[PDB]
Amino acid sequence: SGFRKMAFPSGKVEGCMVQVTCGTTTLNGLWLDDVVYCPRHVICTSEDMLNPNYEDLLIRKSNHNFLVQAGNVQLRVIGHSMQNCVLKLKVDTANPKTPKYKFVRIQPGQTFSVLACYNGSPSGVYQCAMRPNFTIKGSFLNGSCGSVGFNIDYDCVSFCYMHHMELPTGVHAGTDLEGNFYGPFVDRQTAQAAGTDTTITVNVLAWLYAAVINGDRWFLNRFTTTLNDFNLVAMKYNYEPLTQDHVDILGPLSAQTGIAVLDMCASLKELLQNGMNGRTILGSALLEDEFTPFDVVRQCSGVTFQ
Amino acid sequence: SGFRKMAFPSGKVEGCMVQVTCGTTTLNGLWLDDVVYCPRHVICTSEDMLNPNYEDLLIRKSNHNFLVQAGNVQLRVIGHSMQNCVLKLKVDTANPKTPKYKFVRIQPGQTFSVLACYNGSPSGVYQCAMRPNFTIKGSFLNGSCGSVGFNIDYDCVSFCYMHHMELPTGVHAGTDLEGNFYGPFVDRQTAQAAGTDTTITVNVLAWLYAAVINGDRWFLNRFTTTLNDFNLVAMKYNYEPLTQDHVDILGPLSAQTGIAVLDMCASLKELLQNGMNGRTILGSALLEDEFTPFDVVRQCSGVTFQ
Ligand SMILES: O=C1C[C@@H](C(=O)Nc2ccc(Cl)cn2)c2ccccc21
Ligand SMILES: O=C1C[C@@H](C(=O)Nc2ccc(Cl)cn2)c2ccccc21
Ligand code: NA
Ligand code: NA
Ligand code: NA
Ligand code: NA
User: Fold this and answer.
1) Closest ligand (CA of A141)
2) What's the gap in Å between the CA of A2 and the closest CA on chain B?
3) Residue B145 catalytic?
4) CB under 6 Å to ligand 1: residues?
């Protein structure tokens, strides 16, 4: 028992981190097979970042201008190409530590682990959600660009995120591993609007199930609701509308606890309208939305990786 | 910017986890050099756990009764000994993945990362504190015993915790790597009192500094206090008394922010007496005490490991 914001074990990803330097910019790269992936803004100078012409800046660079170091050891660059907002540096050595891996584009509301890195060296690991407005609320200082997000399924690492920028509002934006930003963002040092954000309702409900499984039960009430009634309350409180697909994903947790999904919605309605009256749920005084239903079952069932 | 509950990168520890089986009990072990360390209750049957005679149970076991597996591969056991509440199984092979390491006994209020494991395979990593009453509020299911806690300093892993038990109250107890419990606990399935717990005041103050560094400033006020005055408030709200040693440890954060430690104490006093009026600090609606002053500086300065 107990419920924590748990990250995936980071070792399979730590073996893939490298340092990339171009001119006077150092950031992180991801070395899989004979390719290093990194944010294309490694080729920018401080001036360049207000409105970079990436095609023109990259034409000034040759293979030998990209310095790639894997711990103590220098890699030899034999090709470079830009795909969307990422650079792909072909090197003459396959990474001997390459895990089984996939590149995935995650949906808003899904979770992943971030391995925060500086100068190609890991500093820490934490779990977060892709917000509905395609930002992440991370922990990233200058030099963290090229840090990656990921999920693991037994022995397979699914890379979903590469860090590119901190917006002036102090939230974070980045790409998939094909270099396509999540959300409307561009790799320019400019004020950039993020959507209105919303709370990930299906995740809050998953976490309430987690709370019940752990014996935190005070918020369970005598009430039920409908999808239509609940969703009127969701709109008022800037929660994502609940769909039958979300109900179906919550099926296993409903079966484990014997609490019908709409009964748990009625509990959440009362918590939205009345607050928590200075009480806590799983150590939190807020409704938590960074656990997916899959996360709660994995944590509550002791699933492992190799 | 941003502030997250960040764990240490787990790869150096993942290479050390093994499965240990004795009779019909499987749990985790830690393989460093030619020794595997694991909870001595691996030798207990379900009956045994109400009041085990560990000396008598271990006399019935020979080297060949301890099955130790490192991934797919079986290790050969050439000796066994009990040190306090841990078993040390000498094996005929040094772990080729052994990192630079130390065994440390941490103080209450210090933090560490836990690598939660089942059947010798890592499931997840999270950060927590040793509570003042020497429990931890973890996430541990049956089979997690022998999972370990640790800190990293560049290339050196300091192992501080081995998981042994879930108390009937659903909090967690374990030992240092010499097998000495933290707190009054014994490895028996019995109701066992934990102290009165208290909030780790120096950690709350560190986190308030973290909040200021990140621009969350609403709780800063016009007031100051004294150590004696603050500590009267600490007692009322079950906070650890603040000492000049704690003030000195907070020196760097005070210098970085230009907020005198006693001025930050006056902010914390007002938050204790008035609550947070439905506001948040670094995404939390509670005062957070699982970040040490060293944690806040490391996170806010991008310190890395290798
Ligand atoms: O989280 C981060 C990443 C880094 C950042 O935003 N850098 C960057 C670099 C190029 C362009 Cl075109 C835009 N932004 C940064 C600097 C200071 C603090 C945080 C962060
Ligand atoms: O966190 C844990 C560890 C495990 C546990 O307490 N097992 C154990 C085994 C032997 C003795 Cl003498 C006492 N306790 C457990 C079982 C169920 C749920 C959680 C946990
Ligand atoms: Na970029
Ligand atoms: Na983004
Ligand atoms: Na034990
Ligand atoms: Na303990």
Assistant:
1) 1
2) 4
3) yes
4) A 41, 44, 49, 140-142, 144-145, 165-166, 172, 187-189; B 1
A249: left (phi over 0), alpha (psi -120 to 50) or beta: alpha
- Identify the CA nearest to A11 among candidates B78, B229, B9, B268: B9
Residue with tokens 């040190």: B83
Q: Which two tokens stand for residue B50?
A: 């109400």
Both tokens assigned to B79? 């000796």
Please count the other Cβ atoms lying within 10 Å of the Cβ belonging to residue B55.
Answer: 8
Burial of B256 (0-12, 13-18, 19+ CB in 10 A): middle
Beta strand B111-118 with B148-153 is antiparallel
C-alpha pair distances (Å), B66 with each of B27, B162, B211: 11, 19, 50
Q: How was this structure determined?
A: X-ray
Q: Which residue has the tokens 């120096």?
A: B202
Q: Which two tokens stand for residue A283?
A: 């150590």
Place of tokens 């907070």: B250
- Cβ–Cβ < 8 Å for A226, A233: no
Residue B106: what are its φ and ψ, rounded to 5°? -85, 160
Alpha-carbon distance of B189 to A205, in angstroms, equals: 34
- Judge whether B61 and B13 are in contact, CB under 8 Å: no
Orientation of helix A261-274 relative to helix A201-213, angle to 10°: 100
Neighbouring-strand partners of residue A137: none
CATH 3.40.1170.60 is the classification of domain A1-14+100-197: no
Residues from chain B that touch A137, judged by Cβ atoms under 8 A, are 2, 283
Nearest CA to ligand 2 atom 4: B142
Q: Which residue of A has its CA nearest to B14?
A: A11
Q: Is B15-99 in the same CATH topology as B1-14+100-197? A: yes
Contact A4 B304 (CB under 8 A): no
Output DSSP code: residue B194.
P
Instruction: Answer yes or no: are the C-beta atoms of A77 and A85 closer than 8 Å.
Output: no
Enumerate the H helices of chain A as residue ranges: 11-14, 54-59, 201-213, 227-236, 244-249, 251-257, 261-274, 293-301
Among B2, B170, B303, beta carbon nearest to A123: B303
Q: Is there a contact between A220 and A257 (Cβ–Cβ < 8 Å)? A: no
Break chain B into its structural domains and give their ranges.
Answer: 1-14+100-197, 15-99, 198-301
- Interatomic CA distance for residues A182 and A108, integer angstroms: 9
Closest chain A C-alpha to B87 CA, distance in angstroms: 24
Q: β-strands A66-70, A17-22: how paired? A: antiparallel
Q: What would be the CATH architecture of the domain defined by A15-99?
A: Beta Barrel (2.40)
The CATH architecture that domain A198-301 belongs to is: Orthogonal Bundle (1.10)
Extract the tokens encoding B284: 């939390």
CB-count exposure of residue B54 (10 Å: 0-12, 13-18, 19+): middle
**How far is C-alpha B194 from the chain's CA centre?**
16
